């Protein structure tokens, strides 16, 4: 599970670097397509993901504004 959640963070950072801002729904769907059903075969559900992004925003690794997530 650890390798999973750190892996998710790597993909989340790249998604945001390239696409600049994303809603929870878009992050969720990209992780499902490229990680959950991707070669990693790593499971995540929406509540867990939201809690995770929220912990990232608390720790200022992520910004949440105007309903979407961004890198600081």
């Amino acid at each position: 599970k650890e390798e999973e959640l750190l892996l998710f963070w790597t993909y989340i950072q790249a998604m945001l670097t390239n696409l600049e801002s994303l809603s929870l729904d878009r992050i969720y769907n990209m992780l499902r397509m490229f990680v959950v059903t991707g070669p990693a075969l790593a499971e995540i559900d929406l509540q867990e993901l939201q809690g995770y992004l929220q912990k990232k925003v608390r720790d200022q690794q992520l910004v949440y504004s105007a309903g979407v997530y961004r890198l600081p």
Binding site: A14, M15, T17, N18, L19, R26, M33, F34, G38, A40
Partner: protein, 145 residues
């Protein structure tokens, strides 16, 4: 699909590789169109500049080369006004073993070492030999466009 499987694997490889100043990711829905980001390497005139690129994967990929273009206007000897890149590995030297990471590292390398004998921008090719003037013009027109 097999090509989609391949591109999923290329994505994971890039995610795990930690290469500095390059990144990419499928643009919304499709595995078949991505956005990349390349930062100029330290020591080069492109240091501190970053460029977005589009990568489109055709029917026939990996055997047919992906179409890669700068989205951010890039003033470079080997780049045209439309964002097209003259890079050997994207046309005649394309190998079906190449992946996204390879393409991004090659373009990043092309920034600091252009091929002046094969210019798509002659102004830039001629200015290249004068790096303080090139850098000033590059930086001041990156800001304009």
């Amino acid at each position: 699909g097999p090509v989609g499987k391949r591109l999923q694997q290329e994505l994971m490889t890039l995610m795990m590789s930690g290469d500095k100043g390059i990144s990419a990711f499928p643009e919304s829905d499709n595995l078949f169109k991505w956005v990349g980001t390349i930062h100029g390497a330290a020591g080069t005139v492109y240091e501190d500049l970053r460029y977005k690129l589009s990568l489109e994967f055709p029917s026939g990929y990996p055997y047919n080369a992906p179409t890669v273009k700068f989205l951010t206007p890039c003033y470079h000897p080997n780049v045209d006004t439309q964002g097209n890149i003259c890079l050997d590995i994207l046309k005649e030297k394309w190998s079906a073993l190449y992946d996204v990471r390879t393409i991004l590292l090659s373009i990043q390398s092309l920034l600091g070492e252009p091929n002046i004998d094969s210019p798509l921008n002659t102004h830039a090719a001629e200015l290249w030999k004068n790096p303080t003037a090139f850098k000033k013009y590059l930086q001041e027109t990156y800001s304009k466009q």
